[PDB]
Amino acid sequence: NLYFQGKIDIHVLENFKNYALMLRFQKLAMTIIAQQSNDYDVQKLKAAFLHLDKGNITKLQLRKGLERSGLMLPPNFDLLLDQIDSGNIDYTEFLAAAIDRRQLSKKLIYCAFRVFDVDNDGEITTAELAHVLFNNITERDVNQVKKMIREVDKNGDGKIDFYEFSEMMKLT
Amino acid sequence: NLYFQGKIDIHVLENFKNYALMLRFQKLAMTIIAQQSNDYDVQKLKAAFLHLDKGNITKLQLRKGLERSGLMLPPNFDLLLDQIDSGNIDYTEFLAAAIDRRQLSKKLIYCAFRVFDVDNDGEITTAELAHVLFNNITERDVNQVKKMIREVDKNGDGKIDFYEFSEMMKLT
Numbered sequence: 092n093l094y095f096q097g098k099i100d101i102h103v104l105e106n107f108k109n110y111a112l113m114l115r116f117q118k119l120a121m122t123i124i125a126q127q128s129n130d131y132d133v134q135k136l137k138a139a140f141l142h143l144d145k146g147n148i149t150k151l152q153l154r155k156g157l158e159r160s161g162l163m164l165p166p167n168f169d170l171l172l173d174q175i176d177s178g179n180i181d182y183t184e185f186l187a188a189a190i191d192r193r194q195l196s197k198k199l200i201y202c203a204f205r206v207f208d209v210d211n212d213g214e215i216t217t218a219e220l221a222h223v224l225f226n227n228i229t230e231r232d233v234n235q236v237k238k239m240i241r242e243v244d245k246n247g248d249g250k251i252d253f254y255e256f257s258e259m260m261k262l263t
Numbered sequence: 264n265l266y267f268q269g270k271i272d273i274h275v276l277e278n279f280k281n282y283a284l285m286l287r288f289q290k291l292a293m294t295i296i297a298q299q300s301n302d303y304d305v306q307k308l309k310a311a312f313l314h315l316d317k318g319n320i321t322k323l324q325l326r327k328g329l330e331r332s333g334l335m336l337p338p339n340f341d342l343l344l345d346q347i348d349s350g351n352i353d354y355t356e357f358l359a360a361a362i363d364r365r366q367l368s369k370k371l372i373y374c375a376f377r378v379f380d381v382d383n384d385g386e387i388t389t390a391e392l393a394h395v396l397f398n399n400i401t402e403r404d405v406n407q408v409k410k411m412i413r414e415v416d417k418n419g420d421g422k423i424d425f426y427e428f429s430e431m432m433k434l435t
């Protein structure tokens with residue numbers, strides 16, 4: 092009964108749940124990278140935004156932090172800023188956007204990895220990852236994570252090793 | 264003069280401009296994919312949100328459209344929704360999030376490509392792409408686009424062919 096089979100097809104919600112959690116995963120990872128980055132030109136910006144700040148500052152405050160660091164902003168800056176995020180900005184997200192992901196160093200990527208690999212055994216397991224993404228976690232929570240890693244779990248072992256995490260971060 | 268050289272290093276803004284425009288690029292592309300998708304289970308959701316709607320509806324309205332289509336929402340739906348986007352939602356973004364990008368068909372990807380390849384010669388050129396992303400475009404606009412495609416322009420010819428666009432969309 093094709094009509095019946097279609098009416099009970101749930102793949103749309105599956106895909107969405109996976110996408111949403113993968114997004115959270117990557118944003119958490121980039122928050123750690125942005126914090127640990129040894130690129131001084133990112134660090135000073137981070138420092139400048141923290142002395143204005145929660146994690147949240149107005150876009151006007153972000154522009155000022157940039158300008159006061161010695162940068163000339165392009166005429167369409169505001170339009171570019173809208174693409175990444177009521178006139179306020181998560182500045183760490185800006186900082187993440189300012190880091191070239193294809194050129195991340197192994198050491199910097201490991202700083203992020205280490206945080207998800209809580210027991211430090213070299214594998215981000217479902218329960219470790221669920222912990223990082225949701226930490227009073229439920230059964231349901233752990234299983235949503237287990238489904239989300241399928242795409243980046245290249246060897247099919249149900250865990251994320253460093254190679255897989257790295258691939259995912261360098262977007263390749 | 265290392266101190267001087269660092270003070271005039273602009274790479275942070277470069278990376279950000281690239282990231283922001285690449286994000287716009289991908290979101291436009293997914294808007295077209297979501298609109299043309301032959302997956303009926305996406306189409307009906309699209310139809311249900313349009314009869315509630317701008318492109319914008321409340322998250323409560325999104326939940327209702329889902330529920331009224333026959334779906335049971337998970338207990339943490341609201342938390343998952345926050346990851347993708349004052350209580351309102353761009354529902355096309357939801358629809359995009361519900362599509363598995365690794366499994367996009369060649370025909371569906373081409374529907375998006377065709378829109379950026381305005382002259383239909385099989386190449387998305389800088390000026391074509393700038394047109395799609397910004398269409399009274401300036402000189403500056405065209406050049407920001409030219410810098411942004413470097414990462415997905417695999418053969419270095421300054422244009423995006425279908426293979427490169429496809430790779431970019433399927434996130435691989």
Ligand SMILES: [Ca+2]
Nearest residue numbers: 208212213214
């Ligand atoms: Ca571990």
Ligand SMILES: [Ca+2]
Nearest residue numbers: 246248250251
């Ligand atoms: Ca694995």
Ligand SMILES: [Ca+2]
Nearest residue numbers: 380384385386
């Ligand atoms: Ca063309």
Ligand SMILES: [Ca+2]
Nearest residue numbers: 418420422423
């Ligand atoms: Ca090319």
